[PDB]
Symmetry: C3
């Protein structure tokens, strides 16, 4: 609920605390079926425009079914497979079951009397079935008596329009499945209406607090979901929707922000830099910390973070000590070094870190008062309380207007504890104790000779 920040002048890094967690750890597969009509082309003596329009829309239904047929002749399993495996792997497991004999018949039988069921497949997976569109009922009852005879009966213009409305959702689903090789993400309203999604959430074998969680963030749920095309078989079109399951909930999370920490010598060519690494989202997870390096693997909405553990890292709970004591031996606090003194800025949750070097004009202004702070050479921070923009050189960043308390922790910049001459000025991903050992090694290389 209450968001806070802490800027560490000593390491040129800030930590935004107070966020609650929702980590994806599992998948809920669910089958979405469309009852289709097995009709073959029935060309009849037809002339007046109502039969032509009906026959045209019927051909769009036929090409949509044959397009779905060449789509299932190839199950590419193209979703993920990026060394972290497939994400859709779980949903693919349901499609291989649907290809079994009698398996399309079980969901077709469970949905013989009701629209929404639960079906126990022949592999132990209890999936929830949904039937979102019924074209077999409409084509076999309202359309076949028009095209079945020798000469076509004249359908009313109302039938032509009602048939374009029902057939539309099928046509759009085949269009998405065609351009994406059967696997789509996010799940569009054609794949699942907000109304159908909320009905699937209410029926899940999950706690009521988790149903309130997923229902208040349906947009986040859509963006973290997959729609996988299954099978066209026995007057039934089936495709699987994989919805995220959040195994870690309401757990502490914080966000690390890092910026270069250089020396401010006036001699060009004589400055050395240092930047804490592993910036990003950290969350408590099962006695450890789940770290998320990729920026888009975590969507944040309203004080909670929605992450996917597929692309994360597991760190000891001691990783937090780099935020309070970077010189602490329980944890190997890693940095990267260079001699590149370029000014830059990072917009944090409650303020902005500014690393200003050289002649760069770094400043922070308010919309109505103008410039309220001019930064000197070095690394600094400013709160958003009273600040609107931060400009560094020719670049203007907008400060985030989130409410929260910020705390400035004064301290000596650690780049000053290093002798410039005996410094590793090209180490990437080096630990503090690792760098102290390389400094002990270059000073041993100068003492002996």
């Amino acid at each position: 609920q209450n968001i806070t920040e802490e800027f560490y002048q000593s390491t040129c890094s800030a930590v935004s605390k107070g966020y609650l967690s929702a980590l994806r750890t599992g998948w809920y597969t669910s089958v979405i079926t469309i009852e289709l009509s097995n009709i073959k082309e029935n060309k009849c003596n037809g002339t007046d425009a109502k039969v032509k329009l009906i026959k045209q829309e019927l051909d769009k239904y036929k090409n949509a079914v044959t397009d779905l047929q060449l789509l299932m002749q190839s199950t590419p399993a193209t979703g993920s497979g990026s060394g972290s495996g497939s994400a859709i792997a779980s949903g693919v497991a349901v499609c291989k079951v649907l290809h079994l004999e009698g398996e399309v018949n079980k969901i077709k039988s469970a949905l013989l009397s009701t629209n929404k069921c639960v079906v126990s497949l022949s592999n132990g997976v209890s999936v929830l079935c949904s039937k979102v569109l019924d074209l077999k009922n409409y084509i076999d009852k309202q359309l076949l008596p028009i095209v079945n005879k020798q000469s076509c009966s004249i359908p009313n213009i109302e039938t032509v329009i009602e048939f374009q409305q029902k057939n539309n959702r099928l046509l759009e689903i085949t269009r998405e499945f065609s351009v994406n090789a059967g696997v789509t993400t996010p799940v569009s309203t054609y794949m699942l209406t907000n109304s159908e999604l909320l009905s699937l959430i209410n029926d899940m074998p999950i706690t009521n607090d988790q149903k309130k969680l997923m229902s208040n963030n349906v947009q986040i749920v859509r963006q973290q979901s997959y729609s996988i095309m299954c099978i066209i078989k026995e007057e039934v079109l089936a495709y699987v929707v994989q919805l995220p399951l959040y195994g870690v909930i309401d757990t502490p999370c914080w966000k690390l922000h890092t910026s270069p920490l250089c020396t401010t010598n006036t001699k060009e060519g004589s400055n050395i830099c240092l930047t804490r690494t592993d910036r990003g989202w950290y969350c408590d997870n099962a006695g450890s910390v789940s770290f998320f390096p990729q920026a888009e693997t975590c969507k944040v909405q309203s004080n909670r973070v929605f992450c996917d553990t597929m692309n994360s890292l597991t760190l000891p709970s001691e990783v937090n000590l780099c935020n309070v004591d970077i010189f602490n031996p329980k944890y190997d606090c890693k940095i990267m070094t260079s001699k590149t003194d370029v000014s830059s800025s990072v917009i944090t949750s409650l303020g902005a870190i500014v690393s200003c070097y050289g002649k760069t004009k770094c400043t922070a202004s308010n919309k109505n008062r103008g410039i309220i702070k001019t930064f000197s050479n070095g690394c600094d921070y400013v709160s958003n309380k009273g600040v609107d923009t931060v400009s560094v050189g020719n670049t203007l960043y907008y400060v985030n207007k989130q409410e929260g308390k910020s705390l400035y922790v004064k301290g000596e910049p650690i780049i000053n504890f290093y002798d410039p001459l005996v410094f590793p000025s090209d180490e990437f991903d080096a630990s503090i104790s690792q760098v102290n050992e390389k400094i002990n090694q270059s000073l041993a290389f100068i003492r002996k000779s």
Copy 2:
């Protein structure tokens, strides 16, 4: 207007000059409203197909409004926030104002008599208002007399069709806003027709030369714009369109192309490489140079470059001296080094740089004459005048057919001025003077022992 190129044999790099500039430095927010109809469901005795079709399309209007309602219950502010801040930050500032009382009433009053207005909000922002669709007028005048009574009146088939045409734009806007969590980019023709966009450009408080600039490049303007969902309130649907403002215009720009510069010893394992860094777009901006490292942050159309300063860098105007004298002390000309002699090629604006090493078959051919040039070991360049393709190994690159003059600047490759034994063969982002100091340091490590 006139595009030229310069290849530097000494550093294996080329510069494409002559481009004019258009840098995004600001945002213009504008409110786009849709007048809605506050109706509640009115189930009536209905049987004949025209009432059923009308009631179906009316339900799609109702679900679209409730879907927009759960979308504004969560303002995620998910656009950007990538350490450069939010891009949509400015547009979000307008949405927080719309949630104020009386604020939906001001734009609703300014648009009470005209379609397009200007409205001064209660926070000092003078936004331009547009009213693109009027469903309150259509539902309350043409539809309510059909559904208001006890039994429904029979609407003509013309009313059913005209209502599907007007309601369509609302349905597509909710579909885009649902899959993208309220923030879309680019701005589609459903969000804003080319006709409405041109009318917004003509009304902006900008110079006439800037209106000619944005109007001749509307496609670039759409791709650099954002559509942010605001509020559903008081029979008004409002969402903000953020259009780019180009503060830097008709300013000099050039593009740096770099390729590995290795030695051509015949001994495998004995070659060292060097590659100028910071390749990309450079533009004069306010006495400095704005450098763009990311490739997609700059779209080039017809001799002008359209960049976003949010992801750029500010460099001293002296950065140009790496293109004429890399050994010049006013600027720290940075390179990266390695021992990886792999052949490769870079398609420039007017030609192609080819770095050929080992047994790789590097060649450049014309469509009707065949191979017109065979490259030897080392780094070379060829103009597009008479050249169609360049093949390196099993890879074929197409040479850009842009008209312009190319200039070949002969010179000794600088990788030959370095003794291989005493070379830093793993430096990344190192300056020329930095490398000379490391060579002075490894030669001091061999002289003393």
Copy 3:
């Protein structure tokens, strides 16, 4: 057909063999035309709803043509240009020909009598022409007699509906071309129906085995295609479709998987790591090996790999010896080193490599038996035969269920042949023989002093 795997305990890497190849080496351009109607607005005394609906849909046709007109006033050539050149370069060559006089007349004449032709342009390119929609015929025959007179004739509701159906494909094509600046990929069903694509494949001057190849993988073909907007001219709308040409077919391919290989000392701060580089897809191509570093540049479907040679590398056929003998001098087998002992896992084609270090809980379980293997410190591998998931820390990966034989090649991990004290613990992209020379250099730096 038969997929196999080989895990090398000595280098912590695995190779998935048995895949067949389809590399894109060329482009087939083809022109897709829409015959348009040159009509100007003809406002007439109109009141009853059928004329209003017709005039509304006619205005959507007019704005679509003018939107296409400002789209061709700017040919941005924004597709690619990423230093590998443009991909669309070949297709752009056809658009510059269409702007020639008489050139729209040749395809318009070849398609005067048939729907599908071949046309020899005035630049030697024999392109295949397709005419997918005929609006000039429909507007000039069925619509002009209604709007041509002084007062409008009353069209039937059937005409209003048939005109919305034909005009729809034009409107969707302008919507895609507007948001993407004239260059779209993949090619949607609006740009080309699966039926039109299959008819273009059958007519190509390619072998019958290649037509069977592209027809069985149309989804892969769409995802690797481009649609480029050409010209609006002389009652003809033309745009070019670039389809991939696979010059390398049924050639051997394998996939390299790599994972960190560290020492298992119990002392924190004392471990050194090593990881083979250049992981990805390798395919035999013209006596060499085409290597693909980017992960998305190769789509794999059903034992064959579909790669684009534009973003690839050419390696000596000897690159395979890093998979059997990394210490072999014919090839410089490159690695990268560090001191970062973080546990991680890689899902291979037939199993999973697990690098477990520190206190991380690495394990592999079966769905019904539970944990079937607990990994110790070091690098290991497990087959998918009997294994369902692999968990490392708080991350759970799904093992790929592809059928195939796996082979575990036991051997001493090479990180143990290196003395930790005299190790380059920050080399990136270093060769084995390069590292042995740096170890010979740091041992010479300690022997002399």
